[PDB]
Amino acid sequence: AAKDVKFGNDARVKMLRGVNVLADAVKVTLGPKGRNVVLDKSFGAPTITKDGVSVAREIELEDKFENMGAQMVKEVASKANDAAGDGTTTATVLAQAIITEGLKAVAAGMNPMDLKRGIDKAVTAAVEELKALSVPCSDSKAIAQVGTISANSDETVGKLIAEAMDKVGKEGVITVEDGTGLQDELDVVEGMQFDRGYLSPYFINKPETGAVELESPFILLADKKISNIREMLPVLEAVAKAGKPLLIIAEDVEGEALATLVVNTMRGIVKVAAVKAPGFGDRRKAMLQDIATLTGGTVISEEIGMELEKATLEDLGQAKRVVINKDTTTIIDGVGEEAAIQGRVAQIRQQIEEATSDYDREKLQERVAKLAGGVAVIKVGAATEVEMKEKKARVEDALHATRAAVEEGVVAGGGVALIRVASKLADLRGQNEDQNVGIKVALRAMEAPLRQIVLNCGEEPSVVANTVKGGDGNYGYNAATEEYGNMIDMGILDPTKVTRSALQYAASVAGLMITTECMVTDLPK
Amino acid sequence: AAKDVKFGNDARVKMLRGVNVLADAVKVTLGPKGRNVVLDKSFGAPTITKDGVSVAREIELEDKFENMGAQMVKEVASKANDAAGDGTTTATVLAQAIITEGLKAVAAGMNPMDLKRGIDKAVTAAVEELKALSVPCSDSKAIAQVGTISANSDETVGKLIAEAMDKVGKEGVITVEDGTGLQDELDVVEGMQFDRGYLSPYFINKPETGAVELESPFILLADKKISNIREMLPVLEAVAKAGKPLLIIAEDVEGEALATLVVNTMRGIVKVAAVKAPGFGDRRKAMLQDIATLTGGTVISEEIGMELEKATLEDLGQAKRVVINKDTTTIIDGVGEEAAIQGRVAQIRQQIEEATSDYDREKLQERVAKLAGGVAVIKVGAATEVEMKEKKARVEDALHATRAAVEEGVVAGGGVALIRVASKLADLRGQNEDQNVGIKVALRAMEAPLRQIVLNCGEEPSVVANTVKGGDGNYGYNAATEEYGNMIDMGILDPTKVTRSALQYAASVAGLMITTECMVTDLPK
Amino acid sequence: AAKDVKFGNDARVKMLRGVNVLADAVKVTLGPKGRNVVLDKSFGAPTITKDGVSVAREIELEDKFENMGAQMVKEVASKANDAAGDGTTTATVLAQAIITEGLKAVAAGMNPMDLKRGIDKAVTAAVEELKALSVPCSDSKAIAQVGTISANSDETVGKLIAEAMDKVGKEGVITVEDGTGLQDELDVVEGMQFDRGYLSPYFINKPETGAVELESPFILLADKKISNIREMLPVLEAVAKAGKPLLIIAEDVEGEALATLVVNTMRGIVKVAAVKAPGFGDRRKAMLQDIATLTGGTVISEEIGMELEKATLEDLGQAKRVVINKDTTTIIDGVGEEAAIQGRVAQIRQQIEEATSDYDREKLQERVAKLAGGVAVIKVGAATEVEMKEKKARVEDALHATRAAVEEGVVAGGGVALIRVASKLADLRGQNEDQNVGIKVALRAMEAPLRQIVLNCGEEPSVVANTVKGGDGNYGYNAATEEYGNMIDMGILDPTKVTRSALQYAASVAGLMITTECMVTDLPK
């Protein structure tokens, strides 16, 4: 429809105001002494939470320009969350600082593109410096330490994470469900995991987790696109009679089929969840055959000849449980016979032996690795259901943090890592004065998280920041105890991956922002 | 949609205004001389009541921020009422005092987190001091005394409560009903009680009680989640033909099933109430088997093999009466044969004998206790139905107060308990000046209930407060007679549990309130 | 009345708006292709002028803050004009450029004091570089050249300035006069020249010149302050009877005496104008004695004993003509006998011989220099009275420019001198980033005059500026002919003194304004 365009520095200040609103809302909760923030609920009592993610997701502004600023900063922060598992608040704070300083500079007659280039140079130098300061977390002891730290200083969950870590190797799959007994139970069952996200958010049966947990679902294997729901009618009737959930893995799903399945989930006569086919091409077909072996199902392909209409319940695979992460899937305890899986593993091993291409060999090796390693299962054990839920959440976030730490490393948390790299990079110079100003903007903006944490603690931000910059190594300021020392010794730790991703995404969105003039919006009605 | 965000001290004063409105509305009715408050009725004459709970539930403001403050304070006060059985007004008054003083302090550049920590330390000290000041109420004479006091000084109801307490022991179940004759009737019939709340408030057939009373309902036992209503169709047809109510206990009930059953209750062709399955895992299954033994029903589980479609009226259990409390459920006079129940008791006793884990042993012991103790039955006795209703309500509240007193104890009521604790804790000091100020704020806020009671009585609040603080022990101010003396002597008593819970929840909501900066709401339209 | 105070960047932008208005108003006329600007007149037609000074003096704004900004910039520009004789427009343009860039940088969150220090360093380097680039104008040929150039390319006036310059030496005194005949005349008559300004602007009998020309005025010499007008009554009566203008040279004049003299001048009975006594102490008294020697007057001092009441017309001195400029005075052809003046010269020469102090020797030497050198008179010669006036104005401005050039030197005019200095100082660095930014601000602001001249010519400013910066030496852009070359060869020349003073005063006012935060004014009524 009709749109109104505002461009120039007026658009910039509008977007800055939107980002300021969102950044204040999020940064209030930063740090161990983070102040609570109350969220509206359409009905009943409002919630109260220190979680930055929820408050961030709840922010929408009235006037459109501020809304776009907040929405796009929020989207980049959510991308950072999905990348690692935390650091939305840090990313938003960094974005706010960089935006404020860079837009001030641009309003000061600064070349925005050179500012972007300088910020990019500064952030890549900071990233490599941070990698230099990373501490390995390969040993099981540090793994238990970080697991304990992430879950509010609980050693049992750290021990469980370390045990499962040992069970399923370095790059194993970890899943957690609610254990019946008071004792924690760890077991290894043959499972699956591939990086594919759900078709629509509406399949999420548990919105507070953002996943689709199904019990004993009948999986359907298809190498074809779901053009028409007529093909889905017989299997839909069969599963409706079976009265059990189901999974759909297919080459593609058309939009109308998606609307039909959304309707069939709102009705929920059938618990249907679909997801893109993993792999690609011949690799996709081979791994779909592997899934068929795991779940005892059968692949339905147009090229081979069989059609989805001629699909029985026996043709479908099955598994004890599946979970559809926002960008990943998990299969647990496939019904398929283990001997068949072992034979498939041997076949793919022979394919590896005869493999000559390097990347094809890598694909085959990771295929057999994820085929044979399986999925670990962690069962929470305590007395009361309330503690089932809270300890399950703690185990989930601790697992995310621990795997992030294992992937890259662990650096002194509390925001002091950014301060350390900033002090290390005090003499970084660009190609000219413009990029130099951009570099300085980035360097002084990387101090925002620690300053905000200290301000939330009620102490003086600048004094603490200067004292930390004076020190070297990992010597930072404990927010909780208000005592200086070494973060590694006192356990305040953050994964290298989360800090790196948050910093990079904040820099990316900030640089993208600094170089925008035109805005288009619908008329305010 | 678009959301208005207000953060800083303006959000604080908005929430303070909302809390002030709600607190005035509730505190007006506090005390024996509490002034009446008139409420709105969409049709007919307005209702006039001194009950703080109703007026509290009917308060919610126009502008959103004050509404949030009122709603969160109301929710916490209602949580206190559910936990104990009274003290909604006391909790609201304490919350108002603490919020006013704490926000007044925060406006002076005071560290909110230290204020919260000081308040928490002060309330913990107050709780332990109150426990020290508690008077045991284990003897039957004090039980009768508190029963008489709670029910507007009626000795007959106190005697009945004492008799039932003797019948079903210290932690027995007690239920109230309507007796045909003028004489009061007492009897013990095997029954159930477990802490589970209703799925939906819409199941409440008697909103003024907040419960679901059913006469001769057909109970259905399920260990599975109610995914589809097709499974519920045959049993629903059977019970529609039977023309009797029913109970539903299941592992879970999905939202679509909840909507379907809400529709089936609005039609009310079938009188249906659903509730979560108590226990957990194997313990859950074992107690579901116990329920089947009590009610003569049968557990329908996927794992065993049978399905809910093959549900006959014989398969369902039955009982003479059930009541679905907000967070509890009660079964009365299960049809099942007593010999089978005794055999199950013996089996669980053998399980206790062979039990090794202390927790499993405790679960088995409480299982046999709840299986064998049964449920007490108290039938109100008088002539007119008006007195049936009022005496039933009196028995209900007296039973609540008496069980609360038995659980923890009884302290001098009328608000002097908090005054005594405050006088005892006059020298409590925090880690610094900030926590000390928070401690003083809490201490002077604990005097609010007595001051409000005296103000309602029309006398000078501060004079009476000082006179009470001068005394020691339980000496206080009888508001009703306007005379001083030991409150225990003249029987102005409150349970220790209700005062402790009210104070603790007021402190918790105050700590949440003070540390709030950002508010997000929907735009006023 | 009350006063409105505005501080912060809002006052800065108010001043910026005022400076912008005044600056573009003045700069429209800059350059040989300067565009006309109309002015005000309460009666009759408005006046159209290309003179920056006339338009500048007329500008004042309606709102007080930007009015203060314009007023102070105008005052500093007028100071620049008085210092040398031109460069008001250049000073205003430089001030505008520096103010815009510096206030932009200050809005960029940059330390204003460091900006001021960097600008001061840059302008000092620019001044010394300009002195290095100066071309001497000692020889009579260059004197004639600059005289011709200043007076719109008229060789006769430059020639006349050359002969007068030779007559009265390098530091001589030149006065312009109206000549009866068409031939130009030159004569040397003993006269004074001391740097004192009029007591009041109201003495100005010819406002378009800003001077006080008196014909055959009597002179009253006094070493005392004029406390009371009673002392002035007898001499006032004597000069009123004489019907001739009066000149008052005295130690000081009190404010009420000034009001009395203003009233008398407005009455027109006496054409009196007063001036401060030059010198200091004994030196002042000695030069007053010298003035008495010239004019045949007598010094009336309290210490000697005589009083101003006992003053006859004989006691007063006399001269053929006097002119009182803004801060300058001229006495022409004192009546007193030349032999007495020569005797006084011999006395002061003996004092020089016996002088031991260096500065006293300098004072005596300059005193004999002004006593013996006298004053040259250049009588303009043409036919019509209109050309009398225009050629007299041309002679005035050419004399000012020529003496300015003789004092310091002559650098390539047309604004390219600043461009050359800026190109020479491209690598000047400050102590830190802020001073460096200020240096760059000044360096890029020195290009404003040439850019504005080119823009007034209608050509492309930046292209011409780049082309000039590419060249070295005095190579620049002729605005009139739109041809490049050497400014010296084509005669486009400006004195070193005027450019230096304009740049220095623009830098001074810019430094003062950049470091301004608060402003206090009267309420707008």
Author numbering:
A (entry chain C), B (entry chain B), C (entry chain L): 2 to 526
Please give sentences taken from the publication describing this entry.
Gro-EL is a ring-shaped E. coli chaperonin protein complex that helps mediate ATP-dependent polypeptide folding. It is an abundant, ubiquitous, and stress-induced protein that assists in folding proteins by interacting with incompletely folded polypeptides. Gro-EL forms a stacked heptamer formed by 14 subunits, with a molecular weight of ~812 kDa. Expression and purification of the AAA+ ATPase ATAD2B complex in E. coli resulted in GroEL contamination that co-purified with our target protein.
The NCCAT collected three Krios datasets: ATAD2B-apo (9,541 micrographs), ATAD2B-ADP (12,945 micrographs), and ATAD2B-γATP (10,880 micrographs)(step 3). The GroEL-apo dataset comprising 9,541 micrographs was also processed using CryoSPARC v.4.5.31. The processing scheme was similar to the GroEL-γATP dataset. However, in this dataset we first performed manual picking from selected micrographs to create a high-quality training set. This manually curated set of particles was then used to train a Topaz model, enabling more accurate automated particle picking for the entire dataset. A total of 513,428 particles were extracted from the micrographs with a box size of 256 pixels. From the 2D classification, a total of 148,146 particles were used to generate one ab-initio class. This class was used to generate a homogeneous map with D7 symmetry and was further classified into 5 classes. The final map generated from non-uniform refinement had a resolution of 3.7 Å according to the 0.143 FSC cutoff criteria. The high correlation coefficients for all three structures confirmed an excellent fit between the final atomic models and the experimental density maps.
